[PDB]
């Protein structure tokens, strides 16, 4: 005769049983009986595991996930919360991976110039910049243009957003400006750099946020992010927010990556420098590349540094003493792009090639090549997906099956300047018939 093993077994044992079932089976079980429903909804592990299995969160990001879900659903419990999150996630991933699924497209006007120089995507805000010395802010939820920010006397080329609707910019205008989307104005104008601001990043140390800007003047000025508004500071010495200049590079500071009191910069002098912003001193000088660096990443988690040079190579450095760890050779052209996914180190080159290495041991995980061999202009990645763009090409790749999901979604685009995605929303600054546009794709 039968026996409701699930009800009769000790709680712990039944849960092992459920951990051997795919989510679909777990949902059906939830409707088998009142007790099954109760037993399953009692588990937090059940869903925590799944979320991680599907790469919707990582052990480190767990807690933060929880806090955010609790803010989203006060009256829900941790268990039911995690389940809502998973069910919501697994279905967006289902859409992304479905060849027969087509995202909803929204196309908005871009800048006066056909080229977009930069793009941020956070807090339901899509901010874009261009050589038309303008900054456009968009609404990613209602899919529409919000406002424009004007001020820079030169084309904008670097912009980083900061929680609260605050964002910082840098331009050929040689100034570093802080804006307030809410108020829609430039609340600060930091002068100093004796040349174009080429890159920038914002790091936080001891609950204090700092702005780090690299320039073609070979230096990196450090300013603290501020707590009639157009407050200009013609002089660094008198500027309360100024901190100092990191001198060391002999050429333009092309890239910058930081976290906490550690920032890493890449220059055209073919070198990289690890700075301790707190002590405002040089920590290590990474030498070896035989040509200019176009991108670097500071892997704080692992305490390392990835560098991409025009010398066609990628280098991994140990920031525990500054010595080289490995040299990756998977590109025959200039390697100007890099991203660190929770599971992958992804790199793209001027020959249209894209490589994915294991984020910890750097063994070859995947590699793609745009069919028309054109240089990779942009791309973004998650543990489940890769979106890449080049002239006449915009591709989405399912990183699990390794196969290409969609290849014609933005076919009418002539250039994919910047691409960024998060959850069910994908965004791209593109060019169509000598004009820029913002493309927003919906996968919900």
């Amino acid at each position: 005769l039968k026996r409701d093993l699930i009800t009769s077994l000790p709680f712990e044992i039944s849960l092992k049983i459920f951990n051997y079932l795919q989510f679909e089976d777990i949902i059906n079980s939830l409707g088998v009986s009142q007790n099954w429903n109760k037993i399953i909804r009692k588990s937090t592990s059940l869903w925590k595991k799944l979320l991680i299995s599907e790469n919707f969160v990582s052990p480190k990001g767990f807690n933060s996930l929880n806090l955010k879900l609790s803010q989203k659903y006060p009256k829900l419990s941790q268990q039911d919360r995690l389940r809502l999150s998973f069910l919501e996630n697994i279905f967006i991933l289902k859409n992304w991976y479905n060849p027969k699924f087509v995202p909803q497209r929204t196309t908005l006007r871009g800048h006066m110039t056909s080229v977009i120089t930069c793009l941020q995507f956070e807090d339901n805000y899509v901010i874009t910049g261009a050589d038309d010395k303008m900054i456009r802010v968009y609404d990613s939820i209602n899919k529409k243009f919000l406002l424009q920010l004007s001020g820079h006397d030169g084309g904008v080329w670097a912009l980083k957003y900061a929680h609260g609707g605050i964002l910082v910019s840098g331009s050929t205008d040689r100034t570093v400006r802080v804006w307030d989307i809410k108020k829609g104005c430039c609340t600060h104008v930091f002068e100093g750099h004796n040349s174009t601001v080429r890159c920038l990043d914002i790091v936080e140390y001891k609950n204090i946020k700092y702005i780090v800007t690299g320039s073609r003047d070979n230096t990196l000025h450090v300013w603290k992010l501020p707590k009639d508004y157009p407050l200009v500071f013609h002089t660094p010495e008198e500027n309360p927010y100024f901190v100092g200049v990191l001198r060391g590079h002999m050429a333009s500071v092309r890239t910058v990556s930081g976290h906490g009191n550690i920032v890493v910069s890449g220059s055209y002098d073919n070198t990289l420098i690890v700075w301790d912003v707190a002590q405002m001193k040089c920590l290590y000088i990474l030498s070896g590349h035989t040509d200019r660096i176009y991108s670097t990443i500071y892997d704080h988690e692992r305490k390392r540094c990835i560098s991409a040079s025009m010398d066609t190579t990628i280098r991994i450095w140990d920031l525990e003493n500054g010595e080289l760890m490995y040299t990756l050779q998977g590109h025959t052209a200039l390697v100007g792009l890099l991203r660190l996914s929770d599971k992958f180190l992804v790199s793209a080159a001027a020959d249209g090639s894209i490589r994915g290495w294991d984020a910890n041991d750097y063994s070859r995980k995947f590699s793609y090549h745009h069919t028309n061999l054109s240089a990779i202009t942009t791309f973004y990645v998650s543990d489940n997906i890769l979106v890449s763009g080049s002239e006449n090409q915009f591709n989405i790749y399912n990183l699990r099956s390794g196969k290409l999901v969609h290849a014609n979604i933005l076919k009418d685009a002539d250039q994919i300047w910047s691409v960024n995605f998060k959850g069910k929303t994908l965004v791209a600054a593109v060019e169509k018939d000598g004009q820029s546009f913002l493309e927003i794709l919906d996968f919900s």
């Binding site: 080229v115 120089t117 050589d131 030169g154 084309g155 080329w157 331009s171 050929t172 174009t196 080429r198």
Partner: peptide, 4 residues
């Protein structure tokens, strides 16, 4: 993409 370099600035003018």
């Amino acid at each position: 993409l370099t600035p003018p």
